[PDB]
Amino acid sequence: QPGVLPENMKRYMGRDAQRMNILAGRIIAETVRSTLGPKGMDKMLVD
Amino acid sequence: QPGVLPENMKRYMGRDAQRMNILAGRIIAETVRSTLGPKGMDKMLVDDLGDVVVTNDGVTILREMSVEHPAAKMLIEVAKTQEKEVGDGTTTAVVVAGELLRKAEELLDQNVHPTIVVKGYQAAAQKAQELLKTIACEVGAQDKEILTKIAMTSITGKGAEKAKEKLAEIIVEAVSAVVDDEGKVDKDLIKIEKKSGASIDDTELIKGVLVDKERVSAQMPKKVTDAKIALLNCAIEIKETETDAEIRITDPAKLMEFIEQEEKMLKDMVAEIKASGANVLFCQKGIDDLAQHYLAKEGIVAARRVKKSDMEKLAKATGANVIAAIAALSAQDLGDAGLVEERKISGDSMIFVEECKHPKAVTMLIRGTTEHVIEEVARAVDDAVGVVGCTIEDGRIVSGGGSTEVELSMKLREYAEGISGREQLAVRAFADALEVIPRTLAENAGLDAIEILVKVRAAHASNGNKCAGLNVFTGAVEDMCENGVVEPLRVKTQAIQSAAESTEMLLRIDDVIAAE
Amino acid sequence: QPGVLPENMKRYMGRDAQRMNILAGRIIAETVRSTLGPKGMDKMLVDDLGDVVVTNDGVTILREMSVEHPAAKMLIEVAKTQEKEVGDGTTTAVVVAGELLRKAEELLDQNVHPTIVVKGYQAAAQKAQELLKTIACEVGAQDKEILTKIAMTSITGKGAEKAKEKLAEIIVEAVSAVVDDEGKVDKDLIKIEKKSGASIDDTELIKGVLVDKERVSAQMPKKVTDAKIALLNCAIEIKETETDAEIRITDPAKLMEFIEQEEKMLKDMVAEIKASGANVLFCQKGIDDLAQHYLAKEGIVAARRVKKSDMEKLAKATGANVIAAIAALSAQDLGDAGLVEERKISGDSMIFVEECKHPKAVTMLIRGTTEHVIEEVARAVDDAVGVVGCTIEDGRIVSGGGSTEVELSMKLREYAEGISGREQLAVRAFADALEVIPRTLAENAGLDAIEILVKVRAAHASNGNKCAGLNVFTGAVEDMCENGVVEPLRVKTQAIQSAAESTEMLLRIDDVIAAE
Amino acid sequence: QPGVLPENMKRYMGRDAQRMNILAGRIIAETVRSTLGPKGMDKMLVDDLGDVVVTNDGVTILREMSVEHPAAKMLIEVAKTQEKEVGDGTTTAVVVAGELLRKAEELLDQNVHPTIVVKGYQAAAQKAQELLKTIACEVGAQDKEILTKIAMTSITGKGAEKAKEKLAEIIVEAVSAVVDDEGKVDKDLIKIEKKSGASIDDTELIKGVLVDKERVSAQMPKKVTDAKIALLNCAIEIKETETDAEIRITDPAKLMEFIEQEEKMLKDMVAEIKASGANVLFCQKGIDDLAQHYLAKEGIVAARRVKKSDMEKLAKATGANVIAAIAALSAQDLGDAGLVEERKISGDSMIFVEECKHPKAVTMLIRGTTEHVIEEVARAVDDAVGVVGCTIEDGRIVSGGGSTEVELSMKLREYAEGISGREQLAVRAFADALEVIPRTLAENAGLDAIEILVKVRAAHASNGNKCAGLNVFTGAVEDMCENGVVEPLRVKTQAIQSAAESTEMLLRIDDVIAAE
Ligand SMILES: Nc1ncnc2c1ncn2[C@@H]1O[C@H](COP(=O)(O)OP(=O)(O)O)[C@@H](O)[C@H]1O
Ligand SMILES: Nc1ncnc2c1ncn2[C@@H]1O[C@H](COP(=O)(O)OP(=O)(O)O)[C@@H](O)[C@H]1O
Ligand SMILES: Nc1ncnc2c1ncn2[C@@H]1O[C@H](COP(=O)(O)OP(=O)(O)O)[C@@H](O)[C@H]1O
Ligand SMILES: [Mg+2]
Numbered sequence A: 001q002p003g004v005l006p007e008n009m010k011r012y013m014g015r016d017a018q019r020m021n022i023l024a025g026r027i028i029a030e031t032v033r034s035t036l037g038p039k040g041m042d043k044m045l046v047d
Numbered sequence B, C, D: 001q002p003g004v005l006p007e008n009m010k011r012y013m014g015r016d017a018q019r020m021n022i023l024a025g026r027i028i029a030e031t032v033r034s035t036l037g038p039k040g041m042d043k044m045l046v047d048d049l050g051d052v053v054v055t056n057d058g059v060t061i062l063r064e065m066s067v068e069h070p071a072a073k074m075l076i077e078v079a080k081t082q083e084k085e086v087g088d089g090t091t092t093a094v095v096v097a098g099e100l101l102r103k104a105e106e107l108l109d110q111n112v113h114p115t116i117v118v119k120g121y122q123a124a125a126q127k128a129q130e131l132l133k134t135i136a137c138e139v140g141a142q143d144k145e146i147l148t149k150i151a152m153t154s155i156t157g158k159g160a161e162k163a164k165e166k167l168a169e170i171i172v173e174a175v176s177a178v179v180d181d182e183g184k185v186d187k188d189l190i191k192i193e194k195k196s197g198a199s200i201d202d203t204e205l206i207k208g209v210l211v212d213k214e215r216v217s218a219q220m221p222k223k224v225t226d227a228k229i230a231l232l233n234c235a236i237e238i239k240e241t242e243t244d245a246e247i248r249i250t251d252p253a254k255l256m257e258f259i260e261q262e263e264k265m266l267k268d269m270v271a272e273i274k275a276s277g278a279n280v281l282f283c284q285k286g287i288d289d290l291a292q293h294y295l296a297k298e299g300i301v302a303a304r305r306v307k308k309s310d311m312e313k314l315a316k317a318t319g320a321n322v323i324a325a326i327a328a329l330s331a332q333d334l335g336d337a338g339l340v341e342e343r344k345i346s347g348d349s350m351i352f353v354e355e356c357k358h359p360k361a362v363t364m365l366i367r368g369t370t371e372h373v374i375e376e377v378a379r380a381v382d383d384a385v386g387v388v389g390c391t392i393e394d395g396r397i398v399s400g401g402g403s404t405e406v407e408l409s410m411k412l413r414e415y416a417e418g419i420s421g422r423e424q425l426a427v428r429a430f431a432d433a434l435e436v437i438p439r440t441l442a443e444n445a446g447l448d449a450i451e452i453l454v455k456v457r458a459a460h461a462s463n464g465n466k467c468a469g470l471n472v473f474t475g476a477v478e479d480m481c482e483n484g485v486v487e488p489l490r491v492k493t494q495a496i497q498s499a500a501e502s503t504e505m506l507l508r509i510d511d512v513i514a515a516e
């Protein structure tokens, strides 16, 4: 009757794990992409 | 991840299912145990609207409690079947069922399998029916003296006990009067009427019916001796056609011609009623105010809008035919009564149709000081009507006071001897179960059940008086037949068979699955 | 496991059931104890709407408090039956019942079993019925002197006892006038009207009826002496056929032809009425405006839309027959009254039909200063009408003031001496119970109940005076019959039987099951 | 108004009290029945924190459930006392109590009075204690072969039974080693240590103790053979006076002079210890960091802040006196051990004091692969230690496998013969109840209880074999004694006495009053 793995838990397997890590990675990279080089632009971050 | 069986569901398996059904059964039985016998006590039940029932009656107590538990519901139907088939012995049946369940628990606790107790119970029940047949005494359908003992035994241990002699004689006369050509008794032909009065003793048998009506016009007689009674299924009113018809008047003089044509049709109807020889009329439908007058003019007593169920009993009581077309009424459709009278009983106006020569329906007018006192007399009368009716139909009776149960137990134990293996335990348990009746009769009487049983059994042993039972007043074991403590065979056969069948059904259950 | 008996349920078993029933019963008796006898006091009951009743009347008190306790309700049924069967003695019946329950508890507390108590109570009650028959005195239905004492005894101790001589005389005449052919008395035949006035002493008997109507046209006489009265239950309008009918008009000259035929049908209907010799007319239905004119032209007093209940008392008082077709009316359907007059009473105009010769119905017109004073007078008149009716019907009275209960008590103890067993205790208890009446009469008068009881018993001892009771004023013991303190046998026989029966019923209860 | 007893209160009287107590008893017993014997099964208990216990141990199961029901709690005491007095047979004691209640119900449902049942049970119980004394066999406290069977019987059905033979020999050696000079066994003298490892088979007996400590300085020897052990409960720190004292320095020379005095008296303490000949020291209090250095220099192994419990075990094991003053330390206070060694065990550093010659306390080091596997091995070890201890103390054993209960049951039925009256029913009922053990043993083994009980009884009949019982594996009845299935007399005497006393106490109850 009871669950084996904790019930308050999100799980991502195979293609889904790969997709989330690859995506999270790509998105992080593209946030800073536009800062690169002599013609790079800046960011304003507000906490 | 998701559950297969509904998640909002309580389940009880094996020992747990058995325990809940056995327990629910035993508890139901012990609620009514104390009502049993001459020394039985009553219950007061109050419903959620504040209404009250005080009664000794086993099936009434069980329906009035609003039992929800599923197993308990199953043996309450033992009471309902007993009520429907016999009309008496409703606590006996339930108390036997509860004890069969209790004795089965003892067997299950020794690892006897449920299907084996079931098998033994079926065998014992079947032997029981066989032993009952040989135990029963034959009586004639018109043996007034025995029928009177049958009714008196029924009324014993109720409030109405004090007047049981008068009541029994009335009841025996009432039931014998409605016996049909096949020798059958239809309880519904004994109308029960309940009216406050001076005493339970004022209860009386009417050879006829009470109609909850007054005559339609105070100009009519309110008393008729040797009445000639007409019964009409149609309205004494201007008859309209089924096809839509309308009157067109273009000449002012035609107004009166139509009004006077209608007025004449009415007068013609009354004229046809008078011609049949009728001097009393009951009409299921309406009587035109104008017709009322003509009937009064002709000296004919009439009541209008009588209930259809009243028309039917009037027909049964007076020997009249309910006619549906006034034109068709003939002297031959009239019934007879020695006396039709409008009078007041405890403040209410009613029409008494009485002293009918050979009524096929009859009325018992139950009197008593208060409404609840009267209710309980009526329940007693009902039991008595039931058993007098069974006796008339079956012509077979047994002695009461637990004498027959002891005879059965004793004989069943003999039977169990020749039964091999484990099933023998079940058969012996069934035999021991039946002694719950003599045991409960003694204990309600404040007597010691164990010693009482020793004596009654000894009186059955060898040969051996099948009628020996405990007089709960003297404390002596006596011949119950000689003492007039007797009941119809059908009480025992029905009670034992349903107790067996219902408990067998419960004992087969190994899994209770309850939703919501 | 689930529960077997439903869980919303309260349950009281054995000693607890007995206690709640005995207590509930007793508390019900104690609330009306103080109303008993000539020194009795009154209750003011206010309901949840703010409406007020003040009364000495036991059954009225019990009905008005909205009692919900189940055992209390059963005792209240005792008061309701006393009221229905007798019309007086409702406090007495309930007080005796309460005491019977009190005496039973003493026997239960020393371990007498309930069935023995009820058996003893049943035995004493039956004995008491037959003793009461020997104690009763014979009286003739036309013995007005004795009926008057009966009515006066009834009225004593109530608001109204100031006017008790004229009142009693009026009531004796009223009831005597409505005695039927079988010698029976239907209370419904005495109409009670209540109207503010100068004084309770303005109350009067009308040999006729009071009709809450005005004549339909002011052009009619307000007064007619030696009236011939027509009673119609059909309207005086153009009669419409039962089958649907429509006039079709193609000639403009026919418009008027029909209109005039219809007002000719009106003149005709009126002229038929006049032809009968009728000068007063009561119609259950309507009367065309134009008929009202014609009637008025002919000098006929007509009321319209008279209650059917009014029509019926009109017929009974005047001798008229309620006629359904104006075409039928004849001189022989007409009623007579010495006087018919429309007049104002309490600023309300009404039609008095009075000075009838052989009225089968009459009207007590009860006067008094305020509505509440009047309500209580009417209650006392009701009681007196009941007892006068009982005496007329039964011809049997007993002495009052608790003398009959003391006589009964003394004789029951004698009887009890011959009773062997535990049932003797119950018979003695019943005997003692009955003394609650002389004891309460004396408590309410502030006398010493124990001492006066010794005196009254002494006067009944030997073969003394069965009629000896305590005079609550004088303080002495005297012949109550001689003092004219008397009551119908029926008050005592019904009160004792009801108290016996309903308490035997409660004493049989060993288990109370209350839902919710 | 108002209530005498508190309104927020549940109550159960007579049959209802008997029922809830009996029921609660039975259900508690049913909970552990399946854990009984060689084919017994285990329970997993999870508490509200989510911590889990897996066991076969009857009393452990009952303590870990959160039983709140009051009658259930009474029966759980039966298990707790069995655990304290014997250390084994907790399921048995509770299962017998459960059956005693069940058996009593069938008597109560016959109207045998509770006091009669209680009386019969007391008499049967007392007879049972006399019969057990004659049934028991005598054994010598040094009979290692029988002690070993006692231990093996105890561990059978547990889990650790795979390692039964080695475990049992260890246990017998362990208990023999701590028997005192009056022949008593204090099970507290067998220290239990539980350490994960390669398998249950690695469990060993240590003649000495495991101290969960590390030597105070790495410079001290890690290992020492034929060690001379000092046990101190005084701290090896600078001694302060009890009276408040303070140093006053006025000359800056005395600064270092007080400092040097403090460290010389410290060096003097160590020199006093060295002088006793000790080369291993256990101090209950703290040791100065400087003393540690000195001790290390003198090659003396020392552990500080040792819990008193260990100090006491060390004394018992090595034969040292725990000394409270360093000045008083003598070579005659020193204990002896073959080997003292700091070792890691499963990554845990501990000091082993082992190979003592005649240790008065010893240590069983229990091994296993997982924590929970070890937990249950340790419970089984405790059961066995308990029964080996009983046998050494009492010198009485009985055969197991239900053999003794059957002999007991059979003899008790003989005894019932000579009991007069109803009490006889109860004595027989007690007799029957004991058979729940053989019946349950068979059930758990999937065998048919009824037929095996017939065989085992017949093997006891006449001068049969008191040791005859059912072998659950073969299915044959066998001489349980000869098969080495034996138990201390005390298991049975305690279980039966406890069962009897607690059920007698419960059966005396006719009224349950619960608050809140
Ligand atoms: N005079 C008597 N003496 C002994 N037993 C009697 C007597 N009259 C009736 N009984 C027994 O009482 C039982 C029926 O009692 P009752 O309360 O009516 O229960 P049920 O609802 O089952 O009919 C039967 O066994 C009947 O024989
Ligand atoms: N003049 C009197 N002297 C003594 N007792 C009287 C007198 N008049 C009436 N009683 C008694 O008063 C009792 C009736 O009192 P009442 O308050 O009307 O009660 P209930 O409603 O029961 O009739 C009767 O017992 C009657 O005998
Ligand atoms: N080899 C065996 N054959 C049959 N019965 C046995 C055997 N070993 C032990 N028993 C029985 O099992 C019972 C004890 O089982 P156990 O599960 O330890 O319960 P308890 O907690 O009551 O000691 C005793 O009755 C004992 O006789
Ligand atoms: Mg019956």
Ligand SMILES: [Mg+2]
Pocket: C088, C089, C090, C154, C383
């Ligand atoms: Mg009165």
Ligand SMILES: [Mg+2]
Pocket: D088, D089, D090, D154, D383
């Ligand atoms: Mg064990």
